[PDB]
Design a protein around this ligand. Structure first.
Ligand SMILES: [Zn+2]
Ligand SMILES: [Zn+2]
Ligand SMILES: [Zn+2]
Ligand SMILES: [Zn+2]
Ligand SMILES: [Zn+2]
Ligand SMILES: [Zn+2]
Lengths: 488, 492
């Protein structure tokens, strides 16, 4: 029962989704959530937001600049490394490296090229950037090292107090490492198919497997005495608006159309007459909605809830896409993996009626008729249905997999955003004409493709950030330019 | 445009399927109601008029010979294999024969598992067994070779299909057939894991490495969906003489004792309620004095079954439990963990039968199998059954882990008596009740605590194939031709 390792491990865990409310608000409530189609901003006082594409630097820089992310990560990695090397015990540092990848994947996925390999002990980013490809190559190398070490020490354990993800269970850490490896492999499957295949198939071939049961979901079980940060953030200003962040129209439209029994687990009911679940539209004129925010459905969440990093459902949907779209050898069939993912999701949230849900070949995502009468979407959403069809086209299979993966990944907005950019699925609603404050830079139908680099970097690391933009980014440093694995 | 081989194929494929568990009521009664069921701990005989049975260990030859002698099994199998082979070879389409060979292994594994050494490799086109026997080891080696051929061919042709009418197991879905072949390969690998560990490892690990995987979902369970117009044969057999006895076969005390003790929500799917006051589920004891029970059979719980039900060959739950044992007991590389596989098997089973409350069930570390207090007051078991509990314990001993896996696999394999019987003989689990003193009519040959270890060879073979069956007994069996001698994979 050591404070120093314990404190370090928790610090590392916090660099994924921070326990600091305002940091988590920025990374996941105001950025990930809306860009991934789960959340919608709901504070009339915000004249500049990420969702409206006119965000100021203090909103966009957080992943790359916040002390609670990179500086904290590398400072604490160094501590755990010392402990491992000075107690001749490689387990703690191997687990720390897995958390490193979980944290920094979100960072590169937000900006594209980033400092990574050249970040020294001190955690400073005043050094040359890596290409996003080099970053991903290092991720794979790092995960493989951790997997090898932990598998050699599969019967070892961390103390429970040093691990509120898995209570020091080394085998679950290996499963998460293989699972994360599969996520990142599929991430690069369009741009780097041979590498993706090798990493995807390697993950599934490992003797300890992936996250296959909800009992092994990667969630940070840190809260109860300390409040869940997402809880506090989305509940801010509750009395006036119902909350600073509401569930998005998109997710609720899909789930309403499918009569999805998971809705009761995701959302609180709206105050709009006749409509149990109503989401708030993203990329809208916020000032006009001041008086109406409070009527929409809200995020169902408790101050003691764990924070999700990755679930068993996603792993099934990854294997489904790996086989069906990319032709990788996943030791199974797409039809099985798709249904297993949906079943795992229903079970995760305690919803019943999955059989009828999986048999539904006629229900489609619902229209968005705005009960406030301000942001009604005049067109139809996708006609993609639930029931697996083996004879369907590749495009339909991919839309089917990603749509269900997306629903099942509530509320992992950053992951949903990455999948939306890689695949184009699910078919998210566009920003409105008034809500797109990009001055023409952002296409309302495509949304934000990345965050711009921090102004701090142009000031203090000028030559290096300019190299990244001129040599690695393949476009201007704005929200319209796609990242490497998303380039079409 | 339809040709003779289109028609020949449909009839042939259904014929082959019927050689696993027959659609003929009396054949199925013998193979699975009177033999498999009781010996596996699922079923119990319940006809006061039967003075000679397999469960009492004094069965006559007409009961014991059926697997090896019945025309509805071997003769039908090899006759129809020959037909499908011709179709494949003369239409340049290897899919039908590859599927047929999988069914062959499903059918004949039950036969060798019943007797030990059997005729196999030397059975010619005509389906006659008047030839030299194979050792059980040679039979299993051939099974693996045959499954591997089928898997290779079907995987090369994974997007091909049989017509639906030629396949009431999988409706011609080639990939499901591969999954069943890999699954059957894993079953047979684990079967031989005590006696042939190196071979078992190779076959088990090979099965799970295959690109199309195993049976993982209940939608892909191997069941023969042949009934509805034709009555399920198990339904008819267990319901025989219903008005007097409630049925010729009742659920066994063993299975109900375990499930009652665990408050198992699958009971409502397995059994009909008893007529005994205060006891919803009560099983009938196996290996008892039947004449004394004449007036009481009707009060026990019954097999819950319908005339249109498919007949089960293998389910997704078993595959999970096989992988659980492969990793935990035998140290094979199953690309996962025993804890996961055990829970997945139990979840698949609950889902298969529409039962809820699996989370609470899997969290139960205190409930134990119940005692057997016979409400008739004749065959009460005075001792305690095993104290094995449900909840997975990673720190438990190997022996406890194996008992835990096999016990849940066994419950989940209702009513695959022949498979349960094989697992009981290989592992000693679950801890089945012994025959009673009065119920053991073996004249001392069968140990009441161990039960029947095999069927004796047919008398027909001593008459018409004397030299060959004598060779099997003297050279291959390693013991006398009776119910006490263990088969090769069960030898300690
Ligand atoms: Zn470079
Ligand atoms: Zn399937
Ligand atoms: Zn034809
Ligand atoms: Zn005959
Ligand atoms: Zn699996
Ligand atoms: Zn697990």
């Amino acid at each position: 029962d050591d404070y120093a390792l314990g404190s370090a491990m928790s610090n590392l865990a916090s660099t994924v989704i921070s326990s600091d409310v305002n940091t988590a608000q920025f990374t996941d409530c105001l950025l990930g959530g809306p860009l991934g189609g789960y959340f919608a901003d709901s504070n009339a006082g915000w004249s500049n937001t990420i969702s409206n594409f006119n965000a100021t630097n203090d909103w966009t820089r957080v992943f790359l600049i916040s002390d609670r992310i990179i500086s904290t990560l590398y400072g604490n990695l160094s501590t755990v490394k010392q402990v491992s090397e000075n107690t001749n015990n490689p387990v703690p540092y191997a687990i720390a490296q897995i958390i490193k990848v979980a944290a920094m994947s979100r960072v590169t996925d937000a900006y594209g090229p980033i400092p990574y390999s050249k970040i020294g002990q001190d955690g400073k980013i005043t050094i040359p950037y890596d290409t996003q490809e080099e970053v991903y190559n290092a991720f794979f190398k790092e995960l493989d090292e951790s997997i090898e070490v932990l598998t050699e020490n599969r019967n070892a354990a961390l103390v429970a107090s040093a691990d509120f993800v898995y209570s020091g269970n080394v085998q679950k850490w290996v499963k998460f490492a293989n699972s994360l490896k599969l996520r990142l492999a599929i991430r690069i499957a369009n741009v780097s198919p041979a590498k993706a295949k090798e990493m995807a198939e390697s993950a599934v071939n490992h003797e300890l497997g992936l996250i296959e049961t909800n009992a092994d979901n990667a969630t940070w079980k840190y809260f109860g005495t300390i409040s869940n940060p997402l809880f506090v953030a989305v509940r801010y200003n509750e009395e006036a608006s119902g909350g600073d962040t509401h569930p998005a129209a998109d997710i609720i439209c899909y789930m309403n159309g499918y009569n999805d029994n998971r809705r009761a687990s995701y959302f609180e009911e709206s105050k709009w007459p006749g409509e149990t679940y109503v989401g708030l539209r993203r990329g809208i004129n916020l000032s006009k909605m001041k008086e109406y925010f409070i009527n929409y459905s809200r995020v169902k969440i408790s101050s003691s809830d764990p924070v999700l990093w990755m679930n068993a459902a996603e792993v099934a949907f990854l294997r489904a896409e790996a086989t069906a779209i990319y032709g990788f050898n996943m030791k199974g069939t797409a039809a099985d993996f798709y249904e297993q993912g949906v079943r795992l999701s229903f079970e995760q949230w305690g919803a019943t009626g999955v059989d009828s849900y999986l048999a539904d070949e006629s229900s489609v995502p619902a229209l968005y008729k705005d009960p406030a009468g301000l942001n009604t979407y005049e067109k139809n959403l996708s006609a993609i249905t639930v029931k697996w069809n083996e004879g369907a086209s590749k495009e339909e299979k991919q839309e089917r997999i990603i749509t269900q993966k997306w629903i099942a990944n509530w509320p992992l907005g950053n992951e949903a955003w990455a999948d939306y950019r890689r695949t184009g699925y699910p078919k998210l609603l566009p920003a409105t004409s008034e809500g797109n404050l990009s001055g023409g830079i952002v296409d309302s139908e495509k949304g934000a493709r990345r965050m711009p680099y921090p102004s701090e970097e142009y000031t203090s690391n000028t030559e290096n950030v300019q190299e990244a933009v001129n040599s690695y980014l393949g476009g201007p440093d704005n929200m319209a330019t796609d990242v490497w694995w998303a380039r079409k």
